[PDB]
């Protein structure tokens, strides 16, 4: 149509205007003002622990804010809560559906969420009054599979789904408080900022978006990648973030310059990134890959400075503890390992 | 101190003795993925046996779980990776459709050549043959104009069909089966096999076919432990 034609023309005109503004705001590369600092040398970690007890591949894993308790979700239908110091299993929740793809820990330590192909994020209470661990809630209302759940507090939770929409739920009531639309592909990962006012989300349309939780609108959009985005993580200060995609490339985007700062890639890498995470200082960027290995990148110099090669199958999840002391890694060979 | 640590060890031992009972049940079950072309006849097959529907059945004291994705989108390059440990993908193809047959062929080619589905075998059910017989005897619906090598194709010598069918039906069925088997014999890495069959809504032998095919899959899986 002619209306559709002029709408697409105006959209392209605004796109060109935004690109012009970005190129105007780009004066010096991050790799140009960082060449004066010294490199991190060589980072070589050792496998301190190895948690066994899962039957099938492990999709999710999330540290607790006490930096001691850990949760893992495997495809046999199990949600296991481990004590990471002494290796003892603290809980083992059996799930109603075997296809759990995500799991989360409450920042208070009282609840645990998990969702999957059943389009529901179930909330389990770990502190029942003289009872066992039983399901507290089942947040339903998504149309596609549930890719990520994240707690805001004991009463709010933000979820990503395979129907290209994110949602914000009030656990007490049980209905979607807010719905974040705009993506054109399945939303794969979401990341909360240090303060809980904003959060980023990556989808299968090779784009990432920044949402404000309270208003519910999209602030910024970042389109540096060229394939499906699998992993996303905020910088420790909340002014930048990092993504991993299937084009075998990680990217560090800025929230204030509104464009991509750094690219972490190597020609010898032809596998996609499944998970990314930052250390406590933000100088290290850990990235798990499909070639069964994990690579540590110098987030400022963009040069790889270590490898974590201990898993036999695809590295599915990867998480740094909230105090920066250990790194948990879960793979499709049904083993979580702690590195330090 | 020591009291909390011994309580934690008690809890861990109880959790582990429960996980053993759960592991013994997880190993006696064989999970199957029913992945039809959509409105292709998989509904009849699941009639014979939320976001995902599940059907449990039992053959000769062996337990089978069959999963079918429900409320999902038509894009399946992300939630299909969850089914790489499934022992078999049951792939239903509406053989009467011919362009849905090329769509099913492209789907089968993408599943066969996927990086994570490269060790998973496929039991292929070429359903809806009654309408195919109707259309090939009527001569109003053509396979020639959608598969230009239907002519020039001579029916193979093996696999004598049932005598109650018109030889043209046999020619069409074996043409489609060879169309799938060419992709299946595309060579390369994978360690997986295709077990094609000819079914209908009248059959009641399908669960035993799946049973025997899973038996052969498990046999070939065991046979790999005797190598390197």
């Amino acid at each position: 149509q002619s209306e559709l034609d002029q709408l697409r023309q105006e959209a392209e005109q605004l796109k060109n205007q935004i690109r012009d503004a970005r190129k105007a705001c780009a004066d010096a590369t991050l790799s140009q003002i960082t060449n004066n600092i010294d490199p991190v040398g060589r980072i070589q970690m050792r496998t301190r622990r190895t948690l066994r007890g899962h039957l099938a591949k492990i999709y999710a894993m999330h540290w607790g804010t006490d930096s001691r308790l850990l949760v893992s979700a495997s495809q046999d239908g199990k949600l296991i809560i481990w004590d990471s110091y002494t290796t003892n299993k603290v809980h083992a929740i059996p799930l109603r559906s075997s296809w759990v793809m995500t799991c989360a820990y409450a920042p208070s330590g009282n609840y645990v969420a998990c969702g999957g192909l059943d389009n529901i994020c179930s909330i389990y209470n770990l502190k029942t009054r003289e009872g066992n661990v039983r399901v507290s809630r089942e947040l339903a209302g998504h149309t596609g599979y549930l890719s990520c759940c994240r707690f805001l507090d004991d009463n709010q939770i933000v979820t990503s789904s395979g129907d290209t929409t994110c949602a914000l739920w009030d656990i007490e009531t049980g209905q979607q408080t807010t719905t974040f639309t705009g993506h054109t592909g399945d939303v794969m990962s979401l990341s909360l900022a240090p303060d809980t006012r904003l959060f980023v989300s990556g989808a299968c349309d090779a784009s990432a978006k920044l949402w404000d939780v309270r208003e519910g609108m999209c602030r910024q959009t970042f389109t540096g990648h060229e394939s499906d985005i699998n992993a996303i993580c905020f910088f420790p200060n909340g002014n930048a973030f990092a993504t991993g995609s299937d084009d075998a490339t990680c990217r560090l985007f800025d929230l204030r310059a509104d464009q991509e700062l750094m690219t972490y890639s190597h020609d010898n890498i032809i596998c996609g990134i499944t998970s990314v995470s930052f250390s406590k200082s933000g100088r290290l960027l850990l990235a798990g890959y499909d070639d069964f290995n994990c690579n540590v990148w110098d987030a400022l110099k963009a040069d790889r400075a270590g490898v974590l090669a201990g898993h036999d199958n695809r590295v599915s999840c990867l998480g740094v503890t909230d105090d920066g002391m250990a790194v948990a890694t879960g793979s499709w060979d049904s083993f979580l390992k702690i590195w330090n | 101190q020591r009291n909390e640590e011994k309580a934690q060890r008690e809890a861990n031992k109880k959790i582990e003795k429960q996980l053993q009972k759960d592991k013994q049940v997880y190993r006696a079950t064989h999970r199957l993925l029913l992945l039809g072309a959509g409105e292709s006849g998989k509904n009849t097959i699941v009639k014979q046996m939320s976001g995902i529907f599940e059907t449990k059945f039992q053959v000769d004291k062996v337990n089978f779980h069959m999963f079918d994705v429900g409320a999902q989108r038509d894009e399946r390059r992300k939630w299909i990776q969850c089914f790489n440990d499934v022992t078999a993908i049951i792939f239903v193809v509406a053989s009467s459709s011919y362009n849905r047959l090329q769509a099913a062929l492209k789907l089968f080619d993408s599943i066969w050549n996927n990086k994570w589905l490269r060790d998973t075998s496929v039991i292929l059910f070429l359903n809806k043959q009654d309408l195919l017989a109707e259309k090939v005897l009527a001569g109003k619906s053509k396979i020639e104009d959608y598969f230009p090598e239907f002519a020039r194709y001579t029916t193979p010598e093996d696999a004598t069909p049932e005598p109650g069918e018109d030889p043209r039906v046999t020619r069409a069925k074996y043409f489609i089966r060879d169309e799938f088997l060419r992709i299946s014999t595309a060579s390369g890495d994978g360690r997986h096999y295709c077990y094609p069959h000819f079914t209908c809504a009248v059959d009641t032998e399908n669960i035993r076919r799946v049973f025997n095919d899973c038996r052969d899959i498990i046999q070939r899986m065991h046979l790999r432990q005797y190598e390197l």
Partner: nanobody, 128 residues
Framework: QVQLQESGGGLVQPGGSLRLSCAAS????????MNWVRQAPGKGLEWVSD????????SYTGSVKGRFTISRDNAKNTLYLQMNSLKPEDTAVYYC?????????????????????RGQGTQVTVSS
């Protein structure tokens, strides 16, 4: 951004010839297997043809084999489809699609209703 701009369409008498072009930007064109798909009026999306990374492996659907020919220039990042002896049932909207992952031999959802790495397509009309 990942941009795929198709051109070359138009109205042509039955038996005529066309050459559709597809210009790509925002990705390494030589790492991806490319597809030509089409949507007919009142019908869904249909897979027409595809070509691999180097260009050695080429495939067409049944109803176009012998008439159309696909090709790719990795030096200029362009995908060409030459259509010969068109028929009245070739009138459709043609899309230039890229399948999502590089270096793979499988392209899953190029024919899905909402697919991100497609184009807007050109209308090819066959009439007299």
């Amino acid at each position: 951004q990942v941009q795929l701009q198709e051109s070359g369409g138009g109205l042509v008498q039955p038996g005529g010839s066309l050459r559709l072009s597809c210009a790509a930007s925002g990705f390494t064109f030589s790492n991806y297997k490319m597809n030509w798909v089409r949507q007919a009026p009142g019908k869904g999306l249909e897979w027409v043809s595809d070509i691999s990374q180097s260009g050695a492996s080429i495939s067409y659907t049944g109803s176009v084999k012998g008439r159309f020919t696909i090709s790719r220039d990795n030096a200029k990042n362009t995908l060409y489809l030459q259509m010969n002896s068109l028929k009245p049932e070739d009138t459709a909207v043609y899309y230039c699609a890229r399948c999502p992952a590089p270096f793979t031999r499988d392209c899953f959802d190029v024919t899905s209703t909402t697919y991100a790495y497609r184009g807007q397509g050109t209308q090819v009309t066959v009439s007299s």
